[PDB]
Amino acid sequence: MSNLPVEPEFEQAYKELASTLENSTLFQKNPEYRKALAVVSVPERVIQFRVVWENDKGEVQVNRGFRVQFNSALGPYKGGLRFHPSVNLSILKFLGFEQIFKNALTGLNMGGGKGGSDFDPKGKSDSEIRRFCVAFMTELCRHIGADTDVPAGDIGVTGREIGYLFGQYRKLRNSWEGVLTGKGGSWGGSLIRPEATGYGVVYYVEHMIAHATNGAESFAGKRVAISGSGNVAQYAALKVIELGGRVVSLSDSQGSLIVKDTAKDSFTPAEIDAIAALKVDRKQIAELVTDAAFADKFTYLPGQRPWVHVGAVDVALPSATQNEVSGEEAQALIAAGCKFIAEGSNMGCTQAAIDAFEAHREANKGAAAIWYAPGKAANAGGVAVSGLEMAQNSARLSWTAEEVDARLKDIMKSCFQNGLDTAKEYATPADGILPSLVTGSNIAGFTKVAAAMKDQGDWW
Amino acid sequence: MSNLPVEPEFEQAYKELASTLENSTLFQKNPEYRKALAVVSVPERVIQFRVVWENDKGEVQVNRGFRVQFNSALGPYKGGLRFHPSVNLSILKFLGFEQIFKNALTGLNMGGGKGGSDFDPKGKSDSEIRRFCVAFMTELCRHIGADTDVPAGDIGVTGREIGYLFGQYRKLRNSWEGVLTGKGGSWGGSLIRPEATGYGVVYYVEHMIAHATNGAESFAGKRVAISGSGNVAQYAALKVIELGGRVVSLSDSQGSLIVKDTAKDSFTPAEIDAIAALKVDRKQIAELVTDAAFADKFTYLPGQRPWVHVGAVDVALPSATQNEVSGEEAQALIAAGCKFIAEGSNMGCTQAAIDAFEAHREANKGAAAIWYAPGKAANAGGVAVSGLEMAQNSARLSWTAEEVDARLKDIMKSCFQNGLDTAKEYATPADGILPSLVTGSNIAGFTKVAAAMKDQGDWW
Amino acid sequence: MSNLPVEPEFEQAYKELASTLENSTLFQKNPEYRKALAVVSVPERVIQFRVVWENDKGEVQVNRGFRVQFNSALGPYKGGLRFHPSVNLSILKFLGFEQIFKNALTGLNMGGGKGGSDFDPKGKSDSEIRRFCVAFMTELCRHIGADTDVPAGDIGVTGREIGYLFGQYRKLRNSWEGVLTGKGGSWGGSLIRPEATGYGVVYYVEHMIAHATNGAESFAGKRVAISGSGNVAQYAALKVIELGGRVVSLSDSQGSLIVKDTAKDSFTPAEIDAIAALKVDRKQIAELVTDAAFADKFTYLPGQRPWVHVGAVDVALPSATQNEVSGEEAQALIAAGCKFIAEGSNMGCTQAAIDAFEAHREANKGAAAIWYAPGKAANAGGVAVSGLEMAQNSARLSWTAEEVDARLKDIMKSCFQNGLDTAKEYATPADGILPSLVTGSNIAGFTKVAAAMKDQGDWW
Amino acid sequence: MSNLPVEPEFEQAYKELASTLENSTLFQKNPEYRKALAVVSVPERVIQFRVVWENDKGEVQVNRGFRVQFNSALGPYKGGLRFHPSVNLSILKFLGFEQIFKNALTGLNMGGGKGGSDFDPKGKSDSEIRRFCVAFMTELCRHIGADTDVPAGDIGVTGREIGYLFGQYRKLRNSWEGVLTGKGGSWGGSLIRPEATGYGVVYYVEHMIAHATNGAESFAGKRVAISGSGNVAQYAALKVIELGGRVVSLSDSQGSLIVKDTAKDSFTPAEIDAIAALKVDRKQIAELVTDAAFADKFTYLPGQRPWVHVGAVDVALPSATQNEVSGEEAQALIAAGCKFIAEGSNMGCTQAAIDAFEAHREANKGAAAIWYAPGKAANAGGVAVSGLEMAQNSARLSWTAEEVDARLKDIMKSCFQNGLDTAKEYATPADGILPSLVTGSNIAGFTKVAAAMKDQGDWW
Numbered sequence A, B, C, D: 001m002s003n004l005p006v007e008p009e010f011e012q013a014y015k016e017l018a019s020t021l022e023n024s025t026l027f028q029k030n031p032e033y034r035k036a037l038a039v040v041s042v043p044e045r046v047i048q049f050r051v052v053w054e055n056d057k058g059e060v061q062v063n064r065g066f067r068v069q070f071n072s073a074l075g076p077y078k079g080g081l082r083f084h085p086s087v088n089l090s091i092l093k094f095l096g097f098e099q100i101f102k103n104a105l106t107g108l109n110m111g112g113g114k115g116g117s118d119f120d121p122k123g124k125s126d127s128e129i130r131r132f133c134v135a136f137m138t139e140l141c142r143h144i145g146a147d148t149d150v151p152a153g154d155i156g157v158t159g160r161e162i163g164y165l166f167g168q169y170r171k172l173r174n175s176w177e178g179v180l181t182g183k184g185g186s187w188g189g190s191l192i193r194p195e196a197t198g199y200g201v202v203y204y205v206e207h208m209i210a211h212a213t214n215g216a217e218s219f220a221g222k223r224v225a226i227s228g229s230g231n232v233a234q235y236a237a238l239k240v241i242e243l244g245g246r247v248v249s250l251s252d253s254q255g256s257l258i259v260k261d262t263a264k265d266s267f268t269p270a271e272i273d274a275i276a277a278l279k280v281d282r283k284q285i286a287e288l289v290t291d292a293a294f295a296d297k298f299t300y301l302p303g304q305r306p307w308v309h310v311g312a313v314d315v316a317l318p319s320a321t322q323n324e325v326s327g328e329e330a331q332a333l334i335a336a337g338c339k340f341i342a343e344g345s346n347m348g349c350t351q352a353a354i355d356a357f358e359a360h361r362e363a364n365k366g367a368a369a370i371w372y373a374p375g376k377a378a379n380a381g382g383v384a385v386s387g388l389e390m391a392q393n394s395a396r397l398s399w400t401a402e403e404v405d406a407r408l409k410d411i412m413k414s415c416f417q418n419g420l421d422t423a424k425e426y427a428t429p430a431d432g433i434l435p436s437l438v439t440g441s442n443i444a445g446f447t448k449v450a451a452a453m454k455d456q457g458d459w460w
């Protein structure tokens, strides 16, 4: 197959999944699942399209649009849209492939997809973003729908963009339906959806801590290093603070902002809100680092990730982008006494990082190990609450915050227990060793999908 | 109308419904309902289509496909698919006609339909069945949909076939929706659906026994003769056993299997499971009769139905196919002390059988009479649970087994009460005589449809 | 296959076609065509539907509607609609099947179909026909279209009904297209379409006469017995007359009208016009009995067909309905010196008639033989000109009468030549024996369809 | 833009086009066409999809499907399907991009597209090819249509595959329309379409010879080296022979077959027909090279292209695949006295080859130069006759071979004159130098498209 193009991010995600499936008894019990893997890893459909749009000077601009409709055995295609200058097919295929198995772990009927554009929101006006969204949806519209494919946000796609997108879909298709999630509260949105992805990461990690320490420890007083400062990072940070943990770092594409006293100090909700308001306006953390409220409390490090700069730390939540924890950063976190690392970002750890965490787990009993959880497990609360938003739209009713948050909590608990239990069944660790959450989540997500595909005649 | 073709099964079903309407005060109170009967008896739509498919030898095969969309006043068309070499339009019209009034009895918004093919699954490989299902759905897809017509299983169509059909519908229409019921648990199925049809028959007969005996008797200690060994028979048998009854017979298309000691012995759940496994693989009961688990406990009667061979018996549940209880067999059951017979199978009793049971009811007070219930009442739990699978799919959530089962029980109790009360109203029996469940069920289903049709301007 | 219903008309048409293929070298050269025969003989799609409509007294009325979409390898389904109380699936299948092969002989891309209803236009008012057509098209519209299936008239369906049908399609679908043919001149009709079917029968027979006599005789001076008095009969009669022939009979469903002097007299165009006016009004030829201008010239025979009553005749054009020339009538025509018989009506001759004509052909050298042509050859001029109507509508232009007629003539000549040549090739007659136009037409049409089906993967 | 994947074939085609536009006065006259170039070079739409299909052993197989819908300003998307193991997005984008401008040069309303799969027909049975085509069209169907996108053949896609494709489209969409071209003669094909692509190459070269030699020379007695042995090569070879030229070579993916006497000998039509019959059966030229009819007349060279092996030659027609004339092969052809080289294959010459030809042209007056014509000009007769097939299907009529061939001839003449004249206007050569057909064809195709795009608001 030397005709196939090289897609490094997709191949990375595929290879890690495949390796975890091989390092188990799955293919001894079900060798025919190798056929399922070969089939599932070729997307059902991909749409690529030109997006021509007008800037504020009246000039023609051209960007590339995509929607990867990876798998639909379990439900309509489901997953976000990414507007970022790196975007290409390789990146969206990694994301879409991940999404299949992430969605499977929620328990809801959602197939996997992802899309977006190489349009860069940075440096654009709201008007330019509006015109781009209008043009983007003009083509995307014909390929999506409440029972076909339901997008949502991701990097570069917030409730603002989902609004422009929805309005254009409505205008084109003359239908008001759950074609997108992450919608506004008066026009079919769900309470808790803004909070859901980062809340879920934290909810998942609570279970990891409970399990590893037999209930002795929690987030109370733990030091948590977070990266990113967007939707996932913001609400992860807020949930950590609400549970009495201390957030010692955030970051953006230009640098890291770290409390000067990492043993005892934390970001506050007010500080997070200030950062969030910069981010609505597509500005950098660097802008506020000399204000009174920040200069004395924090150190800003241009060009650096937080991991080697936070001193001793208990929990790490990479929450920005793929491949943002290197192997060396992983070794630093281990040496700093970090015991829990969960991907808020999809494929947030490099392979070298994962290997370092999983070798540590295998070498250190119980609470002495660093325990690594993959994004398909930890990030799944976002998509789950999107599924609940679809359910609300279908019912034509709106649920309470308490009702949605309660379901979110149950879904994350189930997702942890499924990964744990599946790893115990198929990749039983040595006595006193924590089961691999990455292996278990991968096997659990995959076998659900492979079996539904078999039932539906996708492979035989 | 000598241009119309002779359609024996349909005419039989029509004539028995009509006769029961005539033998009542319905047409005295609402003589205009004769117009309704003339309209409702001509199907809204029927689609017939060639199905070309490839066998394992690479050879072209041809079969006939059908979908009868009989009536949609009360909801989208709803009803199963039959793959059996007998299939023709006459058979499918009888079935779809029955389905109108059966569905009306559930309380849910489901119109009447039925479809299938003369493709015979016996002697075919799973691969052959998969190719057949793919080709069948390639044409059927354009006629069905979650809000238009929702098929499901019946003779020769199980969850396996539903899977292949669903998978092809999704590939063709690029939509994941509740277009079929009987789906798999991970891809939109309902708990209790496998059990529902047989469980419902037995739930219905519980109310019959309770009423006729003023609560003195139940299924506990009763001897129950069942025919068939498929989905409806298997779970009717299992529920009888759970309730403390003894199942003395099952049968298939080649013979009956009867316990040697029909006074005291019963099939067990493990024996039912073994027969069920054979039926998944499309093999016959005959294969077992050698196994010492069976040879000493049971007698195999090839070419024979169970009714004359079970000795004294208390309940009969024909659960195979139409016209499987003859007049002679009805007299034998009456002579054998049988006091309850409900159709698990559609039109299970011949007209001569029904006429014997109803004459017996009219001549024998109370618990002395054999009480006959028609399939549109007793078999309604299966389609009812499919309406609930549709409800679950529309809500994008999955209910518990207890929730589905509780609803099933309530639906069967209401169906029984409606038939009873409607017979008391329109065909009031002599003092001490059990009301006619067949007349009552017929009137109750028919009036509901007729009135909805009038409201909707289908007749005036 | 004893599940299949008995369909006598269909079985008759299928058996005659099959017998002529077997009585030839076709299956020695292409034995694999037996598979094509088995596949082609099962219709691709059949739609049947209830038609509820209101009569002039405000009363609900119910009829049955049908559209048989038999084969589409060569083009969109094409063929007429019949409104006649005899209508059922058997009859419309015989018609649609024949249409496949008729259409194949035109050289145009037209697949085979036929439809209609058991609605009887006799005794109905024009308002009732309007209402019926409205209701009929309300369901038929979703199954038809300019590139899908293009109906037209037949028994009981004239330009009047085509108008009501077209208007309703336009109102429902909001499209103006060539969905029907036989349309009116100002709204997409074609010149020569009214005349085409009956003209084409006569044009076809001119070639048979030319061939039988090397051009020395023609219709000039010939005595021609016609049956029926509708669209086909009227224009066949008029063309005969134009060519210098004498039409000695016409007939309707109640009896025959025969010139008293069949050796020398003829219907005139004015007489045919008076008959045509009766038929527009759904009245019978029997009325003409009270008119001395008719009674002086003609004999009216209630309950009789013309064939045994015309004395010596040269050509017979059955032009009413199927199976209107019996074996005994065939023998009488032979004994009366008839040398040409062509079906204006589909399956106009009974099988006993066909066998008599074909035995005579085989036994009598040259112009001593009676020469029989089947409907699929001789009636093909109507559908041909409909294909030209479709061509005009797609062009968005209207052709002259001379242009259409010229094309019609070329089509009929090519049709005749194809049957003659294909018989010489596959069923070569003895020296001096006329080739079988029924065998040749059947092979020619069948091979064209079977080969196109093979190319398209309908069989292999 | 380092996010964009490397697509070598697409970049090669783009860069050559762009370079010819820069090496002219086009962007002095119309500098705003630079914006047009940036827009046009991003495809309007691309669809990629998984194709699962079954082999003759009943095994699941997976291939990748594509349709590049590049530009539609001038018409529906139009262009072939390639089934070859090299296929990927890069290759189909080169082809699709080329197609835009090729189609523009025909004068017909056809936008540019191309598609296909990495399915390899070699080693497959006809049945496997049938099943693959069925699966491929099952997804492709929803993206194409007679007024949206009309595919056809290319490498690995002949009339056989177009048949399976069409039959499945018809079955899915229930429409008979010009959704594909290269169809069979009885089911909407065009006479001359099989011959068109290679005939057109030769017709184009006739004009080149006429022009360069002021009418003194023709193909009569010229020695013509051809590569490939499929549809393009076969009919190019036949037209050369018909015009009295001598075909000294053909080739396939395994080797070249060259006459031993290249000064005086030639392939014959009979020999070409034998090669064509091998190629229908997916066999190699190597199979016949030792038969009596070939061993003595020809030399077979495994692993070699013909160019350096034919001795002195007058005309070269690469007719197999992209990049099949290297720079060294080009220098050899020049040294062998070759004066005309036209691409039957898309992008058949490497860049080094083109540069060698165009430097020779610029260095040598008139008939002393090797004159190079690009595939978008020389190969355009294939697509042109496809456009005529669309026109016939739209008209619902079939044209004569003479009528189609006459239009083909006029289109190729116009295409040569447009390239010639446009090169004279925008890239005027020095006195006595032949104008660049590659530059002129590129500018002519591009400006037509860019201006239609501007008119339609695609750029401004």
Ligand SMILES: Nc1ncnc2c1ncn2[C@@H]1O[C@H](COP(=O)(O)OP(=O)(O)OC[C@H]2O[C@@H](O)[C@H](O)[C@@H]2O)[C@@H](O)[C@H]1OP(=O)(O)O
Pocket (backbone or CB within 6 Å): A084, A153, A154, A155, A156, A157, A197, A228, A229, A230, A231, A232, A233, A251, A252, A253, A254, A279, A284, A319, A320, A321, A322, A344, A345, A346, A379, A382
């Ligand atoms: N290539 C990159 N290199 C370094 N940092 C990156 C890169 N791309 C993004 N980020 C940061 O991550 C944050 C992204 O925030 P949002 O755009 O609001 O995205 P969201 O929070 O929804 O998603 C973050 C992660 O969570 C997953 O759901 C998603 O696929 C992704 O892996 C920002 O602080 C964003 O930085 P900034 O605020 O734009 O400077």
Ligand SMILES: Nc1ncnc2c1ncn2[C@@H]1O[C@H](COP(=O)(O)OP(=O)(O)OC[C@H]2O[C@@H](O)[C@H](O)[C@@H]2O)[C@@H](O)[C@H]1OP(=O)(O)O
Pocket (backbone or CB within 6 Å): B084, B153, B154, B155, B156, B157, B197, B228, B229, B230, B231, B232, B233, B251, B252, B253, B254, B279, B284, B319, B320, B321, B322, B344, B345, B346, B379, B382
């Ligand atoms: N013509 C016939 N004569 C005698 N027995 C028949 C005939 N057709 C079928 N059966 C039997 O009935 C049973 C059918 O099982 P299933 O295919 O699983 O169908 P299901 O249990 O869903 O339906 C049974 C009846 O319950 C209704 O729902 C349905 O329309 C039908 O009247 C099998 O034991 C089946 O026999 P076998 O398992 O295929 O040998």
Ligand SMILES: Nc1ncnc2c1ncn2[C@@H]1O[C@H](COP(=O)(O)OP(=O)(O)OC[C@H]2O[C@@H](O)[C@H](O)[C@@H]2O)[C@@H](O)[C@H]1OP(=O)(O)O
Pocket (backbone or CB within 6 Å): C084, C153, C154, C155, C156, C157, C197, C228, C229, C230, C231, C232, C233, C251, C252, C253, C254, C279, C284, C319, C320, C321, C322, C344, C345, C346, C379
């Ligand atoms: N079952 C029958 N027995 C005897 N005669 C019949 C029967 N059914 C119909 N006819 C007559 O045939 C003639 C039918 O005329 P149209 O309704 O105008 O039909 P058209 O002339 O288009 O068709 C005649 C034949 O030519 C074929 O195109 C078509 O399928 C049929 O086999 C009328 O004189 C009509 O008689 P009347 O005008 O309805 O009494």
Ligand SMILES: Nc1ncnc2c1ncn2[C@@H]1O[C@H](COP(=O)(O)OP(=O)(O)OC[C@H]2O[C@@H](O)[C@H](O)[C@@H]2O)[C@@H](O)[C@H]1OP(=O)(O)O
Pocket (backbone or CB within 6 Å): D084, D153, D154, D155, D156, D157, D197, D228, D229, D230, D231, D232, D233, D251, D252, D253, D254, D279, D284, D319, D320, D321, D322, D344, D345, D346, D379, D382
């Ligand atoms: N990668 C390759 N390397 C060397 N030779 C190649 C390669 N791929 C193809 N060919 C040859 O070219 C010929 C292709 O014939 P057809 O499949 O019938 O394609 P067609 O003649 O329609 O197209 C030839 C050229 O003309 C253009 O229309 C088209 O895009 C392509 O550039 C065969 O002799 C084919 O070889 P073979 O008959 O399969 O061994």
